[PDB]
Scaffold this active site. Structure first.
Site, PDB file in Angstrom:
ATOM      1  N   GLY A  11      74.599 104.053   9.112  1.00  0.00           N
ATOM      2  CA  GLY A  11      73.972 102.952   9.810  1.00  0.00           C
ATOM      3  C   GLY A  11      72.500 103.205  10.026  1.00  0.00           C
ATOM      4  O   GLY A  11      71.941 104.168   9.487  1.00  0.00           O
ATOM      5  N   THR A  14      68.002 103.941  16.162  1.00  0.00           N
ATOM      6  CA  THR A  14      66.707 103.699  16.807  1.00  0.00           C
ATOM      7  C   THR A  14      65.555 104.174  15.905  1.00  0.00           C
ATOM      8  O   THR A  14      64.665 103.388  15.548  1.00  0.00           O
ATOM      9  CB  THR A  14      66.641 104.428  18.198  1.00  0.00           C
ATOM     10  OG1 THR A  14      67.553 103.832  19.144  1.00  0.00           O
ATOM     11  CG2 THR A  14      65.270 104.251  18.856  1.00  0.00           C
ATOM     12  N   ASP A  80      82.401 105.584  16.909  1.00  0.00           N
ATOM     13  CA  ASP A  80      81.804 105.336  18.220  1.00  0.00           C
ATOM     14  C   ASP A  80      82.691 104.444  19.075  1.00  0.00           C
ATOM     15  O   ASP A  80      83.611 103.815  18.582  1.00  0.00           O
ATOM     16  CB  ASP A  80      80.363 104.777  18.153  1.00  0.00           C
ATOM     17  CG  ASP A  80      80.274 103.466  17.397  1.00  0.00           C
ATOM     18  OD1 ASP A  80      80.964 102.496  17.759  1.00  0.00           O
ATOM     19  OD2 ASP A  80      79.524 103.322  16.419  1.00  0.00           O
ATOM     20  N   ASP A 121      68.716 105.952  27.012  1.00  0.00           N
ATOM     21  CA  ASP A 121      69.214 104.872  26.182  1.00  0.00           C
ATOM     22  C   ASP A 121      70.702 105.028  25.877  1.00  0.00           C
ATOM     23  O   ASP A 121      71.147 104.911  24.724  1.00  0.00           O
ATOM     24  CB  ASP A 121      68.396 104.749  24.909  1.00  0.00           C
ATOM     25  CG  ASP A 121      68.642 103.456  24.207  1.00  0.00           C
ATOM     26  OD1 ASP A 121      69.061 102.487  24.881  1.00  0.00           O
ATOM     27  OD2 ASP A 121      68.441 103.323  22.982  1.00  0.00           O
ATOM     28  N   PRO A 124      77.263 102.089  24.095  1.00  0.00           N
ATOM     29  CA  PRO A 124      78.469 102.357  23.318  1.00  0.00           C
ATOM     30  C   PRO A 124      78.203 102.951  21.920  1.00  0.00           C
ATOM     31  O   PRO A 124      78.943 103.816  21.494  1.00  0.00           O
ATOM     32  CB  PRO A 124      79.171 100.991  23.262  1.00  0.00           C
ATOM     33  CG  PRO A 124      78.683 100.250  24.544  1.00  0.00           C
ATOM     34  CD  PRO A 124      77.334 100.812  24.847  1.00  0.00           C
TER      35      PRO A 124
HETATM   36 BR1  LIG Z   1      73.467 103.835  13.465  1.00  0.00          BR
HETATM   37  C1  LIG Z   1      73.801 105.139  14.796  1.00  0.00           C
HETATM   38  C2  LIG Z   1      73.168 105.053  16.047  1.00  0.00           C
HETATM   39  C3  LIG Z   1      73.409 106.032  17.027  1.00  0.00           C
HETATM   40  C4  LIG Z   1      74.289 107.091  16.749  1.00  0.00           C
HETATM   41  C5  LIG Z   1      74.924 107.163  15.483  1.00  0.00           C
HETATM   42  C6  LIG Z   1      75.842 108.300  15.170  1.00  0.00           C
HETATM   43  C7  LIG Z   1      77.126 108.069  14.647  1.00  0.00           C
HETATM   44  C8  LIG Z   1      77.957 109.185  14.398  1.00  0.00           C
HETATM   45  N1  LIG Z   1      79.269 109.022  13.910  1.00  0.00           N
HETATM   46  C9  LIG Z   1      80.038 107.835  14.257  1.00  0.00           C
HETATM   47  C10 LIG Z   1      80.356 107.076  12.994  1.00  0.00           C
HETATM   48  C11 LIG Z   1      80.225 105.701  12.956  1.00  0.00           C
HETATM   49  C12 LIG Z   1      80.516 105.024  11.778  1.00  0.00           C
HETATM   50  N2  LIG Z   1      80.902 105.712  10.661  1.00  0.00           N
HETATM   51  C13 LIG Z   1      81.032 107.059  10.688  1.00  0.00           C
HETATM   52  C14 LIG Z   1      80.764 107.759  11.855  1.00  0.00           C
HETATM   53  N3  LIG Z   1      77.476 110.425  14.639  1.00  0.00           N
HETATM   54  N4  LIG Z   1      78.064 111.584  14.467  1.00  0.00           N
HETATM   55  C15 LIG Z   1      77.196 112.545  14.882  1.00  0.00           C
HETATM   56  N5  LIG Z   1      76.054 111.922  15.272  1.00  0.00           N
HETATM   57  C16 LIG Z   1      76.259 110.616  15.111  1.00  0.00           C
HETATM   58  N6  LIG Z   1      75.438 109.580  15.410  1.00  0.00           N
HETATM   59  C17 LIG Z   1      74.663 106.193  14.516  1.00  0.00           C
END
Ligand SMILES: Brc1cccc(-c2cc(NCc3ccncc3)[n+]3[nH]cnc3n2)c1
Length: 292
Positions: A11, A14, A80, A121, A124
């Site tokens: 994704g 920020t 998440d 910040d 969810p």
């Molecule tokens: Br875009 C966004 C904005 C803020 C945080 C994260 C993430 C997501 C994530 N994993 C959750 C997902 C979501 C969707 N697909 C796979 C993993 N993380 N693992 C370690 N730091 C992370 N930061 C992604």
């Protein structure tokens, strides 16, 4: 970067693109975050975060400053809470699981806050879950490092739904109470299955807050009428009963939400005090039903 193979674009955060990636030597699967713009200050601050280690804080594995770019390598988690709430819409997250998650997030705030480090910040999308029943805070400390922009690098609007009212009123000097407030809003959202204050501008956000909790005044919030963006001309709404706002949350839950939702940041419950709240007396660690 060449030490990594990008598994996939997760994704757009920020600060930049978020990738799932594998360390091309070591095997380890990680979250890789490119940071847009490096300034000496942000390096030293980022490097203080590598030591800030806790079970409910997504572990910062490494900071890489090479080719005059900045990548952050994180422990990977598979889902998440935004998505998990969406998946759980038809029947809601079971209350024992909401309590466990709240309890655990407060543990992680209580850690960072004792070392004087705020998130600023919380939301969810920033709270990440695994199959073991755990929940963890992502991007802790990054707001002080890099700021918090209005739009992302992809012009995606940064949400205001979880922003404390002292920030919206232009207070220059935040405390840890801003994370408590965000978390309070996330807590109400898990319970009702609807965001508490879904504003779509700063004033809509402020006024949504006001309509639920009452327009704040010198009684509930000493010093309020003298904050940078306060205007005597704000409409004055009356506060609504909490019974109307988050049913069917129980008495203990409502009592705690209230303290997490205090206007005066100084009156707002701390993370540490909140862990002691009777709401958590029968707390447990259920395992979530996750589909990956
Ligand atoms: Br875009 C966004 C904005 C803020 C945080 C994260 C993430 C997501 C994530 N994993 C959750 C997902 C979501 C969707 N697909 C796979 C993993 N993380 N693992 C370690 N730091 C992370 N930061 C992604």
């Amino acid at each position: 970067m060449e030490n990594f193979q990008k598994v996939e674009k997760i994704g757009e955060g920020t600060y930049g693109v978020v990738y799932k990636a594998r360390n091309k030597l070591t095997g380890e699967v990680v979250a890789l975050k490119k940071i847009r713009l490096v300034p000496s200050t942000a390096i030293r601050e980022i490097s203080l975060l590598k030591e800030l280690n806790h079970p409910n804080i997504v572990k910062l594995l490494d900071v890489i400053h090479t080719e005059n770019k900045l990548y952050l390598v994180f422990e990977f988690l598979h889902q998440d809470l935004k998505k998990f709430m969406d998946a759980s819409a038809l029947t809601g997250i079971p209350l024992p699981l909401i309590k466990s998650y709240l309890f655990q997030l407060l543990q992680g705030l209580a850690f960072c806050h004792s070392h004087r480090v705020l998130h600023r910040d919380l939301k969810p999308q920033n709270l990440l879950i695994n199959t073991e029943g755990a929940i963890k805070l992502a991007d802790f400390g990054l707001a002080r490092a890099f700021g918090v922009p209005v739009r992302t690098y992809t012009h995606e609007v940064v949400t205001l739904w979880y922003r404390a009212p002292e920030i919206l009123l232009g207070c220059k000097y935040y405390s840890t109470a801003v994370d408590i407030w965000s978390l309070g809003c996330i807590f109400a959202e898990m319970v009702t299955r609807r965001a508490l204050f879904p504003g779509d501008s700063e004033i809509d956000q402020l006024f949504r807050i006001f309509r639920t909790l009452g327009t704040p005044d010198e009684v509930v919030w000493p010093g309020v009428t003298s904050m940078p963006d306060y205007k005597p001309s704000f409409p004055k709404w009356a506060r609504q009963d909490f019974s109307k706002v988050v049913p069917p949350l129980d008495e203990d839950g409502r009592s705690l939400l209230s303290q997490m939702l205090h206007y005066d940041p100084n009156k707002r419950i701390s993370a540490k005090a909140a862990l002691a709240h009777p709401f958590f007396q029968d707390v447990t660690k259920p395992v979530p039903h996750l589909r990956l």
